[PDB]
Enzyme design. Sequence first.
Site, PDB file in Angstrom:
ATOM      1  N   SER A  44       0.689  -1.079  -0.047  1.00 18.72           N
ATOM      2  CA  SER A  44       0.057   0.121  -0.218  1.00 18.72           C
ATOM      3  C   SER A  44       0.983   1.868   0.172  1.00 18.72           C
ATOM      4  CB  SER A  44      -1.592   0.012   1.186  1.00 18.72           C
ATOM      5  OG  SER A  44      -2.089  -0.749   1.252  1.00 18.72           O
ATOM      6  N   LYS A 209       3.390   7.020   5.745  1.00 19.65           N
ATOM      7  CA  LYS A 209       2.501   5.926   4.581  1.00 19.65           C
ATOM      8  C   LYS A 209       3.197   4.663   4.478  1.00 19.65           C
ATOM      9  CE  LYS A 209      -0.821   4.288   2.557  1.00 19.65           C
ATOM     10  NZ  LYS A 209      -1.060   3.141   2.957  1.00 19.65           N
ATOM     11  N   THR A 210       2.319   4.170   5.675  1.00 23.81           N
ATOM     12  CA  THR A 210       2.521   2.095   5.753  1.00 23.81           C
ATOM     13  C   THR A 210       2.167   1.487   4.776  1.00 23.81           C
ATOM     14  OG1 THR A 210       0.638   2.355   6.339  1.00 23.81           O
ATOM     15  CG2 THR A 210       2.183   2.689   8.282  1.00 23.81           C
ATOM     16  N   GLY A 211       2.296  -0.106   4.404  1.00 23.37           N
ATOM     17  CA  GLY A 211       2.588  -0.543   3.495  1.00 23.37           C
ATOM     18  C   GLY A 211       2.146  -2.155   3.812  1.00 23.37           C
TER      19      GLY A 211
END
Length: 265
Positions: A44, A209-211
């Site tokens: 993501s 922003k994480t993934g």
Amino acid sequence: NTKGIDEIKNLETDFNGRIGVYALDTGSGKSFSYRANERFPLCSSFKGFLAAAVLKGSQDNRLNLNQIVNYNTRSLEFHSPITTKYKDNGMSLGDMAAAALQYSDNGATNIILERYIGGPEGMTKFMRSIGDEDFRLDRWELDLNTAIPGDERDTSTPAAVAKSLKTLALGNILSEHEKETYQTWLKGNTTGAARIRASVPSDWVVGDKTGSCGAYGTANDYAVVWPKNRAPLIISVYTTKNEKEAKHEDKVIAEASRIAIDNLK
């Protein structure tokens, strides 16, 4: 050996996976890197760049953030917390882009890719235009999350992610107003408490922003960090493992970030 390298090597050994990190102090120019040029699944994390693409489109006056996006007859993807709430009345393009970043909203992500960015090809084209030669989005949500070892689809390098984030958040691609909006969106992210945000002092401000792929213990996080009375830092941490069923380790990402910050040279 050089400060911090042995520490990250040991972290990687204990994690039994692969860790990629790139950190830069925009004030002194000092940096720290480990496998920064190797490929890792984006998961993501690309959604943070998708939001910037929408802002660039708004700036070029090709798009208008106030445009109401209607999708009342569209089945929403798994994990669409915000778009599901406003399915009846619709949402402004600006609010939809913010949701894709802040809540990792899949419905928002795919709707924006389909209607405004031009799909995986368009997203990749936007990144190429800002100087990113490594980034590549080949699939849509949620297929892009396979994170198969050796597969180059939907990947980038920690260094490329860091450079693109610096260019978009602190460079001259976006105007002063759009950069402020982009930074506000990043600061309002709701999914990064246990990653980069957990590695810094309480009074430092973080935008990230994480993934999380949900496969091969693949997880990541990138951020612009504003230390108290200091120029911002750019941190990019990507991890993956060889076991398909392995769970990701938030603590490993946080520790890799702590090591990077304490070893800028």
